Amino acid sequence: ANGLTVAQNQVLNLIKACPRPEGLNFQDLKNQLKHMSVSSIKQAVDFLSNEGHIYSTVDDDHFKSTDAE
């Protein structure tokens, strides 16, 4: 069922559970998850994009979601 890594699971959750209308920017991802390296976050983002959970709303750093239930 959950075909995602525990690390990515949290990353995706942080974006969809963010109380910000802008969602969660790339600069915010590393801000919240300081233990998450840029290289790791970029990979996760790409995977989450292929998983169709997140997307670039109006910028590559401006991440937003909708369905991740």
């Binding site: 998983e51 169709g52 959970h53 997307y55 670039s56 991440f63 909708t66 369905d67």
Partner: protein
């Protein structure tokens, strides 16, 4: 047979870029609707202003028209299928989830697959996805 052969699935030239399943309980963005030119024409304006698609284009395949659109708002595949299947009162409909957007568009722009109309100025780009 003796007339226009109506298929119940997508052409082998695009099956390689499709998820095949429509009842897949997962989120998606790229959706393709294999239908009639008249039907795809209506959906072209309807879906565009219904899901605020980032890209929508009508392509010619072989015997029918293929409506290719990408919805920014994340939603389940079956959610779109129910909407499309509902408009099959005057014509059939083959809407399935697209596995590879850019890749499918690449095939939809070669020899048999012609490009009629599209919203974006030159198909899909890197601005519609994430590098």
């Amino acid at each position: 047979g003796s007339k226009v052969e109506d298929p119940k699935d997508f052409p082998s030239e695009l099956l390689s870029f499709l998820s095949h399943a429509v009842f897949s309980n997962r989120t998606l963005a790229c959706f393709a609707i294999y239908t009639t030119k008249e039907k795809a024409a209506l959906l072209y304006k309807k879906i565009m202003e219904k899901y605020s698609v980032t890209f929508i284009s009508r392509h010619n395949s072989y015997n029918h028209n293929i409506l290719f659109f990408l919805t920014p708002h994340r939603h389940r595949v079956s959610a779109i299928n129910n909407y499309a299947q509902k408009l099959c009162t005057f014509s059939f409909l083959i809407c399935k989830g697209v596995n590879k957007e850019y890749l499918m568009y690449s095939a939809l722009t070669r020899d048999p697959f012609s490009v009629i109309e599209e919203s974006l100025p030159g198909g899909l780009k890197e601005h519609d996805f994430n590098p």
